[PDB]
Amino acid sequence: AKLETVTLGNIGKDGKQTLVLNPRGVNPTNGVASLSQAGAVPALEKRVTVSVSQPSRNRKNYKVQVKIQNPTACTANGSCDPSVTRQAYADVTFSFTQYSTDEERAFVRTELAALLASPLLIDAIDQLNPAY
Amino acid sequence: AKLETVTLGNIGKDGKQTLVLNPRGVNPTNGVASLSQAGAVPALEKRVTVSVSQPSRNRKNYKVQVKIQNPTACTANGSCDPSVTRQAYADVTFSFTQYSTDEERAFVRTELAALLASPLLIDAIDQLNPAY
Amino acid sequence: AKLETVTLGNIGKDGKQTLVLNPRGVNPTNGVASLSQAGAVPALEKRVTVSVSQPSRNRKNYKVQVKIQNPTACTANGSCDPSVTRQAYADVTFSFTQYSTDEERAFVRTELAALLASPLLIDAIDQLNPAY
Amino acid sequence: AKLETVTLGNIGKDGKQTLVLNPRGVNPTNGVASLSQAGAVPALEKRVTVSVSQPSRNRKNYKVQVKIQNPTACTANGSCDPSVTRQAYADVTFSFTQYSTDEERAFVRTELAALLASPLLIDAIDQLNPAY
Amino acid sequence: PKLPRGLRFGADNEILNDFQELWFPDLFIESSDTHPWYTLKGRVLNAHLDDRLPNVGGRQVRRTPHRVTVPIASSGLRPVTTVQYDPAALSFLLNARVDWDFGNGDSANLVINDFLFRTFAPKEFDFSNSLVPRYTQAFSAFNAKYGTMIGEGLETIKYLGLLLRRLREGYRAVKRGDLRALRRVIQSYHNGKWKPATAGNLWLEFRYGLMPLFYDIRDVMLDWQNRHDKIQRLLRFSVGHGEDYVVEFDNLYPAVAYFKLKGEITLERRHRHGISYANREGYAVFDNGSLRPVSDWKELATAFINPHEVAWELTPYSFVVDWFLNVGDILAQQGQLYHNIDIVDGFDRRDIRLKSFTIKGERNGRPVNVSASLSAVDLFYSRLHTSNLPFATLDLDTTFSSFKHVLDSIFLLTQRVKR
């Protein structure tokens, strides 16, 4: 549907964190939409990117790419302006076949989320731990 | 933590779908864990892969890679055995800096999930639609 | 915001001149919007072009380019159709740094306009005169 | 007269068979009209061809040629598409002299039909039998 | 939202044009304004007055959005853009600069630009009485005028298949070991005998024997691609004629309480009918590229004839089998355009363009010199899609039947080159 303000509740380890994302427009070249938090400095502002794709002579498969960019502001650099320190990269992709059905895709969508809420990944993500 | 049976509720467009994943062990070569539904034919069985990484002389950043493989069984091929038809590929990666903090990562984890539940992506995913 | 009909009052040395600009669409290749007066012949019709940019491996800076094209119609060429005679080129660009703040930019926007209303530029523009 | 849809009743050994023929146009080269049943595959569709002629330096006589082509569809060839098996050829010609009168010709037309309904030819045609 | 206004699904997830909507669109009502406000630059009543006032008008025009999509036939022409336009008494923007000098104090000059008005124009007409007869007349001359090019290409394609039946013997000669038959074919190519006699490899002898043969086939496939596209343009038969006509109009009052303006405008009532000739069943299965493109055919042909290859240490035997397999696949793809080709789509587009006209100036009966220029914005565009003909006379099946079995024998020959 239409790019809109996207509010998000239940965020962060607390789950009391909330975030809104304004539509940033769409880069027509790569054909990729953009979403962002409204901050002060766009360089500091959180970014969310989604894209679709269509099969070509190069590839017969659909690609759905989602990337998230969350920098780390250094408030006091010893200078009057904050500066980017660390840049968190969150990337998600999807592949499908021209005959892919709806529920299959839908099935993929939820389960990925459930994993993200699974106690497995949290140690993997938060504490950077392998499967043991 | 330890690889375990991972039960998942609230799956698929319905959300009444449930899935369990048994620990498949870990390939030590690539250093990647594996999880699977318990089906009949492993080739048919759903697969879930997670991995961590550690910075080397090649890269100073942590990588967390998660891939999901959900084939499509053809029950009647005209033959006595089912066969793989379409292979759904779901891939997720993560990048972090050695100075990355906990909550930053935690912040990334939830928000990605929220997006997956956001009304935006569902049309993007399920109905394969761009941002309009 | 959305491309719309852009009405402009207080135009020309008189300031009683008015102009409207219809959205012409956006060339996706260069990623540049286009606006125009609604005339008879598009070749004769006034054109207004705006564009944004995003930093790449080639440049770390934002570019905002605005060009204006105002031809000069020759009504009677001795032929049944008017013809382009002189082509007025008005070009404006902007550069910014990823850390550029809002008010800085806003500060730039107004002051440029004020100059255009300043008694300095009018002789420079209208009468083509240097600073003396 | 004009090529038209030609409906035919009382067809086949039953005589309950009916057939329609759409005008197929006329090949100008040979100067021959074409008629056909409307089927799925033109190769399968029944064909009817009629032609007139006019005396030349080569021949002083009129020729009227009528050919009928009724293939035999093989529905299941073991392949997804039907295929021509047997091709029934029905050919009829006529010769006349520049002084040929109307009723003479008319006399020819009916009697040929009557023969086709005569009990003689049916065994000759249907059961492939000589005159005994 | 998965289905656009011009696309339709299928049984195998195929995106085809929706013929239900593409033939007859939906009539959309237009409520917006094109140019409701026009400006005046001049003087009147010996006083400087620059104001903006709306004139008469009204917006009732039925329009449909254009659609440009991929064709519905392999190696075919673009689909027709079916757009319905309802005439509302099309207005022309009046740009007239008049300069009058009379009296002793009554002198003014003003230019009225972008003045729209309403006339009486015929909304419908019919030219089929002169077009349809002339339409079937070109069919008789088509076999004499273009028949030479058709028969010439038929002979150049048959010789290609003959070369393909001969080179299969040299390839298999290395397989089982019959090298005696190889030396019989090589000697029948060169004028003299200069072949290498040194004992080399077993497969290297196949390269020397086919040296002139590689250059022969290269020139065949080169110019064939150009002639293949030349004959596709002849299938689209479109003929028409223009005739002169004059339209009279009156009741123009652009100069309120000053004068009236009249004139004459000459139009050209034109008509042309196009037809489409393609596969009857071709438009049932298609996707957004599934086939082998033709933009690289000119480059990929010389990729094997050149003495320089990158596959020598890459198992050349596998590349050779794949090369012939790709040739038969492309030949089978083009071979599906001659099986049964009949009239599939038809359309009749009528339009009236604009020509040079004259404008006469007058002021309440006095002659005055007036110089103006006008242009056309909207025109009649209604392409009515239908399938029917008043007198249908066409036969192209037997003419192209000789080309169908030629590629069939070639496609069945490559099946004997398996592993």
Nearest C-alpha neighbor of D31 from the set E210, E143, B24: E143
Among the partner-chain residues E139, E397, E398, the one whose CB lies closest to the CB of D28 is: E139
Rounded Cα distance between E31 and E11, Å, is 39
- Tokens of residue E92, six digits: 């022309």
- Tokens of residue E414, six digits: 């490559």
CB contact under 8 A, C98 and A42: yes
Rounded Cα distance between E382 and E347, Å, is 10
Residues E342, E343, E344, CA angle at the centre, nearest 5°?
105
CB contact under 8 A, C16 and E50: yes
Q: Which site among C30, C52, C101, C105 would you substitute to test the A interface, given the most A Cβ atoms closer than 10 Å to its Cβ?
A: C101
Q: Which residue in chain E is spatially nearest to C42 when comparing CA positions?
A: E377
Phi, psi of B4 (to 5 degrees): -140, 175
Among the partner-chain residues C16, C20, C80, the one whose CB lies closest to the CB of E373 is: C80
Class of domain C1-131: alpha beta
Q: Which of residues 65-104 of A touch C (CB under 8 A)?
A: 81-84
Q: Are E184 and E172 in contact (CB under 8 A)?
A: no
Resolution of the coordinates, Å: 4.4
> For residue E41, what are the β-bridge partners?
E111
Bridge-based pairing of strands C17-27 and B17-27 is unpaired
- Tokens of residue B87, six digits: 């292979």
Q: In chain C, what are the domain boundaries?
A: 1-131
Nearest C-alpha neighbor of E333 from the set E389, E279, E252, E370: E279
Check contact C-E (3+ Cβ pairs < 8 Å): yes
Give the alpha-carbon dihedral of E2, E6, E9, E14, to 10 degrees: -100
Q: How far is A83 from chain E (nearest CA, A)?
A: 43
- Contacting residues for E277 by C-beta, under 8 A, at least 6 apart: E235, E236, E237, E341, E342, E343, E344, E396
- Given CB atoms, is A128 within the 8 Å cutoff of chain C? no
Nearest C-alpha neighbor of B91 from the set B51, B37, B60, B31: B51
- Contacting residues for E141 by C-beta, under 8 A, at least 6 apart: none
- Given CB atoms, is E404 within the 8 Å cutoff of chain D? no
Query: For chains A and C, what is the number of CB pairs under 8 angstroms?
Result: 23
Bridge-based pairing of strands C17-27 and A47-51 is unpaired
Q: Which residues of B60-94 are buried (b: 16+ CB within 10 A; e: fewer)?
A: ebbebbbbbbbbbbeeeeeeeebbeebebbbbbbb
* Helix H or strand E segment including D33: strand D32-36
Nearest C-alpha neighbor of E94 from the set E70, E78, E110, E79: E110
> For residue C97, what are the β-bridge partners?
C61
Q: How far is B30 from chain A (nearest CA, A)?
A: 12
CB contact under 8 A, C40 and E114: yes
